[PDB]
């Protein structure tokens, strides 16, 4: 019954009326409303589906952002604000500010398009201080994604540009905020097997192998180069491919994650169990390549951003870089007076 509740005009609660659909999940959706009793400012009201585990998702967000808003009350470390919650429906629905489009949707609505460099260093930065100070209170985010990174405005400029033949959108205010913490983990709770959505999942968590902070720090890489490239560089829904594409760009597995994992299925002799020459093979290596192939520039500040990612894509989450050494890293010099 979401269909029938989340409809443009309609109220909810007596005071937020649908403008449209700003996005859509599996958990629910996400709307744009007029907020009648702040005097008509427009905000977001995530509607939560009427199932088990979205509702406990839900209220274990609830929780996670009283605590985050309160120790950050004027949102220093760019997690979004919540405003407030209610029922409609039997439907759980949390208010936050209005922002602008996610990281994701601009890309999309862009031609899969990629940020500039300068953007990507500002954006980076701000990530980066946002999810270290969810380290530092005991919290993994877990499911990092450029859909679950805003803009704070994503108004943009638009020429013709000769070099590509196309209408071009440019970025105004690179500005974000990190959102949904609906997966978001302490350190002392029960910690899921599976986590993160595919494409930003770590290979620890792939493996099964536990995880904690630095399964963010991988997505995070896994984020930096979807911006600078316009694209996934995982783009699979089938672990053992992804794990193929993995070894592809980034070179083999270490031994010891293989020895220690508890999904066998995808080895052989502690080798990842993979014909290279089969169709899905062929399409892994022709389409994938080392990490540092896709750089299109040779410039220092280039090498710079993929030395960044290439630590925060470190297989092994004990030794990959830490969000408090890669807000040091000389990528970030440039923003420094
Ligand atoms: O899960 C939350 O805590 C969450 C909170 C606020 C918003 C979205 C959220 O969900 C995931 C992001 O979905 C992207 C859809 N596009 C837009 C666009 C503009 N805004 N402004 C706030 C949100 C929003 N979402």
Same mark, same amino acid.
């Given at each position: 019954?979401?269909?029938?509740?989340?409809?443009?005009?309609?109220?909810?609660?007596?005071?937020?009326?649908?403008?449209?659909?700003?996005?859509?999940?599996?958990?629910?959706?996400?709307?744009?409303?007029?907020?009648?009793?702040?005097?008509?400012?427009?905000?977001?009201?995530? *509607?939560?589906?009427?199932?088990?585990? $979205?509702? #406990? +998702?839900?209220?274990?967000? &609830?929780?996670?952002? =009283?605590?985050?808003?309160?120790?950050?009350?004027?949102?220093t470390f760019r997690?979004?604000?919540?405003?407030?919650?209610?029922?409609?429906?039997?439907?759980?629905?949390?208010?936050?500010?209005?922002?602008?489009?996610?990281?994701?949707?601009?890309?999309?609505?862009?031609?899969?398009?990629?940020?500039?460099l300068d953007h990507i260093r500002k954006m980076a930065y701000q990530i980066c201080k946002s999810?270290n100070f969810?380290?530092?209170?005991?919290?993994?985010?877990?499911?990092?994604?450029?859909?679950? *990174?805003?803009?704070?405005?994503?108004? $943009?400029? #638009? +020429?013709?540009?000769?070099? &590509?033949?196309?209408? =071009?959108?440019?970025?105004?205010?690179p500005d974000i905020?990190?959102?949904?913490?609906?997966?978001?983990?302490?350190?002392?709770?029960?910690?899921?097997?599976?986590?993160?959505?595919?494409?930003?999942?770590?290979?620890?968590?792939?493996?099964?192998?536990?995880?904690?902070?630095?399964?963010?720090?991988?997505?995070?890489?896994?984020?930096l180069?979807?911006?600078?490239?316009?694209?996934?560089?995982?783009?699979?829904?089938?672990?053992?491919?992804?794990?193929?594409?993995?070894?592809?760009?980034?070179?083999?597995?270490?031994?010891?994650?293989?020895?220690?994992?508890?999904?066998?299925?995808?080895?052989?002799?502690?080798?990842?169990?993979?014909?290279?020459?089969?169709?899905?093979?062929?399409?892994?290596?022709?389409?994938?390549?080392?990490?540092?192939?896709?750089?299109?520039?040779?410039?220092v500040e280039?090498e710079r951003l993929?030395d960044l990612?290439?630590?925060?894509?470190?297989?092994?989450?004990?030794?990959?870089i830490?969000l408090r050494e890669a807000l040091k890293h000389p990528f970030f010099d440039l923003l420094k007076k």
């Amino acid at each position: 019954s979401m269909h029938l509740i989340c409809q443009s005009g309609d109220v909810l609660s007596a005071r937020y009326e649908i403008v449209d659909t700003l996005g859509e999940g599996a958990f629910g959706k996400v709307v744009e409303c007029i907020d009648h009793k702040a005097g008509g400012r427009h905000v977001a009201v995530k *509607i939560v589906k009427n199932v088990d585990r $979205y509702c #406990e +998702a839900a209220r274990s967000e &609830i929780q996670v952002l =009283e605590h985050l808003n309160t120790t950050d009350p004027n949102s220093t470390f760019r997690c979004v604000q919540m405003l407030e919650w209610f029922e409609h429906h039997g439907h759980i629905c949390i208010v936050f500010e209005l922002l602008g489009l996610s990281t994701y949707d601009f890309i999309k609505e862009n031609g899969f398009l990629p940020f500039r460099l300068d953007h990507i260093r500002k954006m980076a930065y701000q990530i980066c201080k946002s999810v270290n100070f969810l380290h530092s209170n005991k919290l993994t985010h877990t499911d990092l994604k450029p859909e679950n *990174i805003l803009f704070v405005q994503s108004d $943009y400029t #638009e +020429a013709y540009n000769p070099k &590509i033949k196309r209408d =071009e959108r440019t970025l105004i205010n690179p500005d974000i905020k990190v959102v949904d913490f609906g997966s978001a983990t302490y350190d002392d709770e029960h910690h899921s097997t599976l986590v993160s959505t595919r494409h930003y999942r770590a290979p620890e968590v792939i493996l099964a192998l536990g995880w904690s902070q630095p399964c963010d720090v991988w997505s995070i890489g896994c984020i930096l180069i979807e911006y600078y490239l316009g694209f996934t560089v995982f783009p699979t829904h089938d672990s053992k491919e992804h794990l193929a594409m993995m070894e592809r760009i980034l070179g083999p597995l270490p031994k010891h994650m293989i020895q220690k994992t508890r999904k066998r299925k995808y080895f052989h002799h502690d080798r990842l169990d993979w014909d290279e020459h089969s169709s899905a093979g062929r399409y892994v290596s022709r389409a994938c390549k080392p990490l540092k192939e896709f750089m299109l520039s040779q410039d220092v500040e280039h090498e710079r951003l993929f030395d960044l990612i290439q630590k925060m894509l470190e297989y092994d989450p004990a030794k990959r870089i830490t969000l408090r050494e890669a807000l040091k890293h000389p990528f970030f010099d440039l923003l420094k007076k």
